[model samples]
Target: GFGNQGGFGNSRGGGAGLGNNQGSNMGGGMNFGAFSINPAMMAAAQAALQSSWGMMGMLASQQN
Candidate 1:
């Protein structure tokens, strides 16, 4: 039923797949890396998209 439970981890995916293999080391480092990178890039993305997307209750109006 569960092949990954013992032999390998399936749901973890391919890119971060190597991290989960030996999470003891890579997991902490990689997780931190992704988090730090996101804040700056994420804010820029939000600002740029803010003009067209907005940061309010536009969801109900956008149900198309």
Candidate 2:
């Protein structure tokens, strides 16, 4: 769900999983930790991959 703010983790099978955990920032601009995406980009990507069923849309919704 796009409304959900969560964490992403890598599994032993090399697949990624989403967690409900929220992260804490440990640095300043340009060096900020934790991967994040702009809401606008997320929405755009969501629209692109929405046709696929049961797919994790994170990759499609990713941005720098």
Candidate 3:
């Protein structure tokens, strides 16, 4: 029953959603106005997230 009743119309809710979306985008490149990025850039970003200092091992530690 958490429909758009009271605080659901608030800007914070929209901001939080955008924040979450950006968090997901951190795994790769984000939107940059009407411009676009190169394929190598995406590949590099994906590689970083899979590296040792990235989400590769840290995500596994939370399982315990």
Top lDDT: which candidate number? 2
Residue-wise C-alpha lDDT for candidate 1, range 1-64, written one tens digit per residue: 2233545644443343543454443222223322122333234253464333323332222335
Q: Can you write out model 3's per-residue Cα lDDT over 1-64, one digit (the tens) per residue?
A: 2234565545322322344353444332344332333343345353454333322222222334
What TM-score goes with each of the models? 0.15, 0.11, 0.16
What CA root-mean-square deviation does each model show from the true structure? 12.5, 17.0, 14.8
Q: Best by TM-score, which number? A: 3
**Model 3 reaches what TM-score against the true structure?**
0.16
Model 2 per-residue lDDT tens digits across residues 5-62: 4568532323223435476433222322244543332343534643323434454454
Residue 25 CA displacement from its true place in model 1, Å:
9.8
- How high is the CA lDDT of each candidate model? 0.35, 0.38, 0.36
Predict model 3's lDDT versus the native: 0.36
Ordering by lDDT = 2, 3, 1
